Design a protein around this ligand. Structure first.
Ligand SMILES: *[C@@H](CCCCCC)C(=O)NCCNC(=O)CCNC(=O)[C@H](O)C(C)(C)COP(*)(=O)O
Lengths: 421, 82, 421
C-alpha cells in the first residue's frame, strides 16, 4: 500500500561503559569493559562475584541522576525508571526532535520497557508492611513496580501522544521495543517512536536467584568472567543500563534535516519450543527468527556482513547461535563477522536488545565492528570471525547490512535487521 | 492546656513547608493541594503521613481523602481539642 | 494482497465467574459476579475488604489445576502461569487447532503476558534468604517471576514455534497481546497466534499497595463494591484470572473449516501525556485511541454498535471514558450500547484486555450485550445506554462492530475493533 522506510535519528546510552553516544561508542571500540568485582558484606556468600554498573558522578561519561530528574522524583521512582528517562532525554536531544505541535505529538509514540521488577523495592516495602503496618506503606510502591512507568514519564515530559507500548519480556524487551516500533511506523500508526529498554536489578537477592538458576559466571576475576564464544565460558555477567533509540519515517527525517544513523529493514520473531532452560541445540529457533527478519527486510543471507550476537558467555547458548549462523549463511558465514559486546557491557537484560541495536546501528554508521572481548583462542566448532579482542574495520563491496540477535528465556528469539543508508 | 489551634496550624504549615513538591511562597492555609499546589493524590497521601508523624495519631484513609487543604487538615487535628 | 483478514476461532477463559466458554458467557449475561469478601486474618489491616477469585474445585466451572498441569508442575509454577496454561489449553481445544505439522508449528505463535509479578513469592524468598542464607533460595525462583514463563510453557506444550511475544504492559497487557497478534498475522509473520493474558496478584501486599494508591474500593459490601458508571463508585475491585484467544488468518481458518466467532478489524494505541496519576478528564487519549482503531479498521464511528468499556468503577476514569465516547461518536453515541463487565469479573489487570476482548468477540457472535452490574441509579452526565442490570439483545441487520477499550497507568490507551462476520 504505502511503503514507509524507517530510520534511526537518535541514540541515548546509559551503560556500564558510561553515558553519551560518542563516549560509549569510542570506549566500546577501544576494548573497554564495565564488568567489575562485587564489594560489601551483602554480596558475600553469593557464588557470583562480578557485575557491571553504570558509573555515577559529575565527571564526563558518568550518569548523574540529578541532570535528568528532580529531587522529588529521585525519591519517588525506581532506578530503572530513572535510567530510562535519562537515556530518553539523551536520545531526543541526539535526534533534535522536540514536538511542540499537537500534530507532531500525536505522531510521536513511546515504546520503552523494563525486563524485571527491582526485587529490592518489593522486599523493603514488604518488610515495612510487616513491621510497621499499612499506614507506613508508601503510595509510590505500586508505581515503582510498574513496567510502563518509564514510558509514561517520558511521554509526559516530551509530550508524546502517539502509540504507547511498554513491554517487558525480560531478556528480549529491548529487541521487541525496537522491532515493534519499526512495525508501527511502517504501518502508519506513527511518524516517530521513542524506543528502548532499561534494567537495574543488581541486588543480593537478584544475583542469588540467577546464581541458583546456574545462569551466572562463577569466575572471581572481572577481567575474564564474561568471555563469549570462549572455551572457558561459565555463565553470563549481570549488567544494568538503559538504551533509547529514536525511530522515524525516512522522508519525515530527511525533510526536517535530521542526522540519520541507519535504516531498520527487518524484524523477526520465533519460538524454540524445545525447553524452558535450554536453547535448541541446533539453534533451529534462532535460525528461524534470523531468516524471518531477512524476509521482512527483502534481503538474502549473502547480503549480511555483520552480526551482533546474543552470546552471553554460556556453554549451550553461544554454541546454539553459532550453529544457526552457520546453517543460515552457509558458505557466506565465513565471509561475515560476528561479535558479542556482552564482554564490555555485561548482559543488560531488558536493555540488552536496545543497546545492541544501538551498537549495530553505529557499526553501520562508522563501518567499524566492536570486539568480542576475552577471546584469546577458539575451539574448532567456533571457526568464524568473531572480531576477537580488537575492533575491525567493516569492509564489503555491497551495502552495510547487519543483524542483531536477542534470545530469551522460554526460547523466545528476536532478530533486527539494520542497514547503512 | 493540651493544645492551641494556631500552634497546630504552625505545625501543619511546618510540615507542608518541609514537603519538597510544595512551593513555599505559593503555600497558603486555604491553598488546595491538587487545584493550586499542583499536587497529585499520591502526593496528598504522603502529606497526611507527615501529619500523622507530627501529631502522633493515625488518620484513617477515609478522613484523609477529605483533607484537600491545610486549613482543612488543621480542623481535623483540632477535633481532639475544642 | 500484503494485508490479510484475521479472525478469532477459539476462546478459553479462567475467570472469577468460572471456567469454560459457554459457562462464563451464560453466567455473565445472567448477571452473576465473582466478587466476594476477603477471608483472611492478614487482610484486617488494609481498607479493601473485597476481591474476585477464580473458583477452585472439581465441580463444573471451578478451576482444577490438575486437569491442566501435573502435581510436580504445580509446586514449581506460580498461580498466574498455571491459569494461563489452562486458559490456553481450553482456547486451543475450543479452536480445535492442534498443530502437528512442521509447517503448522512454525506458522503458529504465542502472545501471552502477565501484567504483574506475584509479590508474595518475592517476599517469601527474600525473607527466607536473609534469615536462612543463600542455600535456602529455590532454583525455581527466577523462572516464576519471569513474565514470559507462561508463554514458554504453552509454546512447548502445544508445539508453537512461530513468533513469541510476551508482553507485560500492566493493565493493557491482554489488549496488546491480541492487537500485536493481529498485526503479526496481518503482516504475514504467522498464520495463527495464541494470544492472551493472566494475572493473580491478590495478596495482602498487593492490596496494601493498591489501597495506598487509593485505587481500590473501600466498600465492604461485595455486591455493591464494583459499580461502573454509578454515582457512588469508589475504586476498582481486584480480580485474578486468565483469558486466551486463538487468532487466525481468514483463509487458513476457512480451509480447516473452523468455527469463526468474529473478525479482528483494527488496533489502536495512544498516550495521554497529561499525567501519570490521573486519566485526561476530557478523554483526549481514549478518543484518539478509539479513532486509531477505527482508522485501522476503515470503519466510520457510525458503524459501531457496542463498546466494552474499560470502566473500573473509578470516579475519574469512568467519567473520562464516557467523555471520549460522547465526543467521538457524537449523536451516534445515543444509538450505540456501552457496557462494563468489571462488576462481574473484577479488574483482572493484565488479563483484563484479553477477557474483555473475548467478551466482545462473543458479543458479536451472538448478538447479545452483557450487563453493567449495580447500575441502579444513573447521573445526567452518564446519559448513554450502558446496558444497565440486565443483558440486551442487539440484533441489527447491519454488520455488528464493537470496540473494546483498555486504559492503563501512565496514560497508555489501547482499543480493539472486533466485528461479527
Ligand atoms: C491498572 C491498575 C494500576 C493502578 C495503580 C495506580 C492507579 C491501571 O492502569 N489503572 C489506571 C487506569 N486508570 C483508571 O481507569 C483509574 C482512574 N483513576 C486513577 O488512576 C486513580 O484512581 C488515582 C487518580 C491515582 C486516584 O488517586 P487520587 O486519590 O485522584
Amino acid at each position: 500500500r504505502l511503503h514507509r522506510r524507517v530510520v534511526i535519528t537518535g541514540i541515548g546510552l546509559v551503560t556500564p561503559l558510561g553515558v553519551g553516544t560518542h563516549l560509549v561508542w569510542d570506549r566500546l571500540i577501544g576494548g573497554e569493559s564495565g564488568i567489575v568485582s562485587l564489594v560489601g558484606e551483602e554480596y558475600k556468600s553469593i557464588p557470583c562475584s562480578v557485575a557491571a554498573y553504570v558509573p555515577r558522578g559529575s565527571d564526563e561519561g558518568q550518569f548523574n541522576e540529578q541532570n535528568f530528574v528532580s529531587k522529588s522524583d529521585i525519591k519517588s521512582m525506581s532506578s530503572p525508571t530513572i535510567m530510562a528517562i535519562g537515556a530518553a532525554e539523551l536520545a531526543m536531544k541526539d535526534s533534535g526532535w522536540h514536538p511542540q505541535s499537537e500534530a507532531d505529538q500525536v505522531a510521536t509514540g513511546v515504546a520503552i520497557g523494563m525486563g524485571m521488577i527491582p526485587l529490592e523495592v518489593v522486599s523493603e516495602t514488604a518488610l515495612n508492611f510487616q513491621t510497621k503496618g499499612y499506614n507506613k506503606v508508601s503510595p509510590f510502591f505500586v508505581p515503582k513496580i510498574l513496567v510502563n512507568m518509564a514510558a509514561g514519564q517520558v511521554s509526559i515530559r516530551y509530550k508524546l501522544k502517539g502509540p504507547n507500548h511498554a513491554v517487558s519480556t525480560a531478556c528480549t524487551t529491548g529487541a521487541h521495543a525496537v522491532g515493534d516500533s519499526f512495525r508501527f511506523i511502517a504501518h502508519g500508526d506513527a511518524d516517530v517512536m521513542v524506543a528502548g529498554g532499561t534494567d537495574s536489578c543488581i541486588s543480593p537477592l537478584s544475583l542469588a536467584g540467577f546464581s541458583r538458576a546456574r545462569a551466572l559466571s562463577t569466575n572471581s576475576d572481572p577481567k575474564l568472567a564474561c568471555r563469549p564464544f570462549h572455551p572457558k565460558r561459565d555463565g553470563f555477567v549481570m549488567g544494568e543500563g538503559a538504551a533509547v533509540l529514536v525511530l522515524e519515517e525516512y522522508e519525515h527525517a530527511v525533510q526536517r534535516r535530521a542526522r540519520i544513523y541507519a535504516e531498520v529493514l527487518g524484524y523477526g520473531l520465533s519460538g524454540d519450543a524445545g525447553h524452558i532452560t535450554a536453547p535448541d541445540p541446533e539453534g533451529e529457533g534462532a535460525l528461524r527468527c534470523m531468516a524471518a527478519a531477512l524476509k521482512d527486510a527483502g534481503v538474502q543471507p549473502e547480503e549480511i556482513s555483520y552480526i551482533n550476537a546474543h552470546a552471553t558467555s554460556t556453554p549451550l547458548g553461544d554454541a546454539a547461535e553459532n550453529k544457526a549462523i552457520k546453517h543460515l549463511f552457509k558458505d557466506h558465514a565465513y565471509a561475515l563477522a560476528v561479535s558479542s559486546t556482552k564482554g564490555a557491557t555485561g548482559h543488560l537484560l531488558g536493555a540488552a536488545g536496545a543497546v545492541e541495536a544501538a551498537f549495530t546501528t553505529l557499526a553501520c554508521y562508522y563501518q567499524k565492528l566492536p570486539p568480542t572481548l576475552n577471546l584469546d583462542c577458539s575451539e574448532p566448532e567456533f571457526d568464524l570471525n568473531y572480531v576477537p579482542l580488537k575492533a575491525q574495520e567493516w569492509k564489503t563491496e555491497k551495502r552495510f547490512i547487519g543483524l542483531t540477535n536477542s534470545f530469551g528465556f522460554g526460547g523466545t528469539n528476536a532478530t533486527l535487521c539494520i542497514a547503512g543508508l | 492546656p493540651p493544645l492551641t489551634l494556631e500552634g497546630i496550624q504552625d505545625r501543619v504549615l511546618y510540615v507542608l513547608k518541609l514537603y519538597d513538591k510544595i512551593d513555599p511562597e505559593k503555600l497558603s492555609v486555604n491553598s488546595h493541594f491538587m487545584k493550586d499546589l499542583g499536587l497529585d493524590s499520591l502526593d496528598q497521601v504522603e502529606i497526611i503521613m507527615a501529619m500523622e508523624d507530627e501529631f502522633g495519631f493515625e488518620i484513617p484513609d477515609i478522613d484523609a481523602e477529605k483533607l484537600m487543604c491545610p486549613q482543612e487538615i488543621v480542623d481535623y487535628i483540632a477535633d481532639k481539642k475544642d
